[PDB]
């Protein structure tokens, strides 16, 4: 019963949501530039900053709704396309349906849009995490950094082109564009003075991996003059070229997606970055690397043993889990948790295009939401209690019961209770790893889910419980409606996404 109307509606929605975002950004930027001689806030109720905040927030939100609709259309379209290809067995019949483009808006960068489930999951993560982070950064943007209210819109446009393109070069360029806005945010919006050095560490560490990926892309392009991302089927790389490409790709994308030993920059940046931008970084900016690694390694044929890469990922997991205990800083502890989860996700991609990719994608989504939740809780603690250190913070539950309850439920979700996409992703990865290498699976599970979990829980429980006798004149009140509903939405997603259609998982 599938008809061409659904196909064209899917394509039109995907194409036009990008232009909706772009036109919103363009209008907002034109207003901002041409309303004032100097593009800084006027400290009065009639400033354009209020309009810009409104436009950014409710462009992201409306584009997120349209993205939900377009993602559902894509799911139907992909399912029915697979059915059309698979169903017919007659040799004379073949599915050759050709679509003509609309005459209203042009194709951005003269590229035909191609959408995949992983790309749309990444785009949904971008939308939601960007919404949370923009909601967080309101107190940070003041009177000279208001120009960074558009950072998340720029991120959304970059990610949209990144996930809706079938061109290798455009793919790589979109991946590399993410550096400038993130560096500028960390440099100009971070309150702490150590953020200045943290930004440089972030730039250099990420750029080393960017150069590695650039070398790999140069190898692919120079050898294969193609750029369509599908002509690689008709060209085979020799053993030496293939091993060089996989090594470069893995190391370069692991610089971004933190792997052992390349997580020093991540720890520094998470500790010294804005509490609202740490959410976006951990939640989304480390998963574009995973998506790019998946695309490249599934496109290239590799005839090498992945034991070395699996060992690197497992070593990162073990290192982060063991170090969890020794952190009294909640933000650094959450950063180590992010490193652990990202290393597990990266390990999920070490078997080419096997079924491990499904667990990897689900784990990427759950880690995004869980890291957003954890960093937002740390943000609330730091903002109301003027410290994010375990020695200075104690007995949160008895003065701010809602915040303590949020911490406890965050710990329960992090533990991986059944009924959560966290548990589902752990089940996928461990079920595969048990047959792949059962002893390695046992070691990984033991370390991560006992030693790292206990180290993680020690600090959070100590902060939540106790007796806050110190500085009774300065104790805060409670979570606000904004914070409470953000926490509730994170919990709601982590719980209900387990009912998403199992066809794609």
């Amino acid at each position: 019963m599938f008809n061409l109307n659904t196909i064209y509606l899917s394509r039109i929605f995907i194409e036009f949501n990008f232009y909706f975002l772009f036109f919103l950004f363009l209008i907002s930027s034109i207003i901002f530039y041409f309303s004032k001689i100097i593009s800084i806030q006027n400290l009065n109720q009639n400033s354009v900053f209020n309009f810009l905040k409104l436009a950014n927030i409710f462009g992201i939100l409306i584009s997120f709704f349209i993205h939900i609709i377009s993602f559902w259309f894509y799911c139907i379209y992909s399912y029915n396309l697979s059915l059309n290809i698979f169903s017919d067995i007659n040799l004379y019949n073949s599915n050759s349906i050709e679509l003509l483009n609309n005459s209203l808006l042009p194709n951005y960068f003269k590229s035909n849009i191609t959408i995949d489930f992983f790309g749309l999951i990444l785009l949904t993560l971008a939308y939601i995490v960007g919404f949370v982070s923009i909601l967080a950064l309101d107190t940070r943007l003041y009177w000279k950094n208001i120009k960074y209210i558009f950072s998340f819109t720029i991120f959304l446009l970059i990610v949209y082109v990144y996930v809706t393109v079938s061109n290798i070069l455009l793919f790589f360029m979109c991946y590399e564009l993410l550096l400038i806005p993130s560096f500028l945010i960390v440099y100009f919006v971070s309150p702490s003075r150590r953020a200045i050095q943290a930004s440089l560490y972030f730039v250099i560490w990420t750029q080393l991996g960017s150069l590695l990926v650039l070398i790999a892309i140069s190898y692919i392009i120079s050898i294969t003059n193609t750029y369509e991302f599908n002509d690689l089927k008709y060209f085979n790389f020799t053993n030496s070229e293939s091993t060089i490409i996989i090594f470069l790709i893995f190391l370069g994308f692991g610089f971004k997606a933190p792997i052992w030993p390349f997580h020093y920059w991540l720890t520094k940046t998470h500790v010294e970055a804005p509490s609202g931008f740490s959410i976006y970084l951990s939640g989304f900016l480390v998963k574009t690397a995973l998506y790019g690694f998946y695309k490249f390694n599934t496109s290239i044929f590799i005839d090498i043993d992945s034991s070395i890469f699996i060992a690197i990922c497992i070593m990162g997991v073990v290192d982060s889990s063991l170090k969890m205990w020794g952190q009294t800083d909640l933000k650094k502890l959450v950063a180590y948790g992010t490193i652990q989860e990202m290393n597990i996700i990266y390990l999920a991609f070490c078997w080419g295009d096997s079924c491990a990719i499904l667990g990897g994608i689900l784990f990427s989504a759950t880690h995004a939401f869980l890291s957003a939740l954890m960093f937002f809780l740390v943000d609330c603690i730091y903002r109301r209690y003027h410290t994010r250190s375990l020695v200075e913070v104690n007995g949160i539950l008895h003065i701010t019961p809602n915040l303590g309850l949020s911490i406890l439920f965050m710990l329960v979700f992090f533990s991986g209770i059944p009924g959560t996409i966290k548990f589902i992703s752990e089940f996928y990865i461990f079920s595969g790893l048990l047959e792949a290498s059962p002893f390695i699976c046992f070691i990984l599970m033991l370390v991560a889910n006992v030693l790292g979990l206990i180290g993680f829980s020690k600090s959070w429980f100590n902060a939540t419980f106790g007796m806050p006798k110190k500085n009774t004149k300065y104790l805060p009140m409670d979570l606000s409606f904004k914070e409470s509903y953000i926490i509730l939405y994170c919990f709601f997603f982590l719980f209900i996404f387990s009912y998403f259609s199992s066809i794609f998982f």
Binding site: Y33, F34, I37, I38, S39
Partner: protein, 102 residues
Amino acid sequence: MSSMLIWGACFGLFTRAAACKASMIPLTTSPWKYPKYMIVSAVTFYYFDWYRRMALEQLCYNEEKLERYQIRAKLQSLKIGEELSDAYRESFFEHAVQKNNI
């Protein structure tokens, strides 16, 4: 879009606005410079649009000659003893006898 003159006019308008903003002067200062910048930008970008296509056409024509150089450069680059080998003997004789038509 499609008109290089209009594209250059828009570029000049935005350049003037950006110059005013950077100098911190009101955007209405020196109004006569708006049409001036638009006209200059339109004309220069129109000329460059013509020049790029002329350069591309002449480059395509030059590549024909460069192919002749590559073929003869390859034969002269052959290592000693390879010019009479079975893989290059016929081509060498073609370029040394048939093309010796002066």
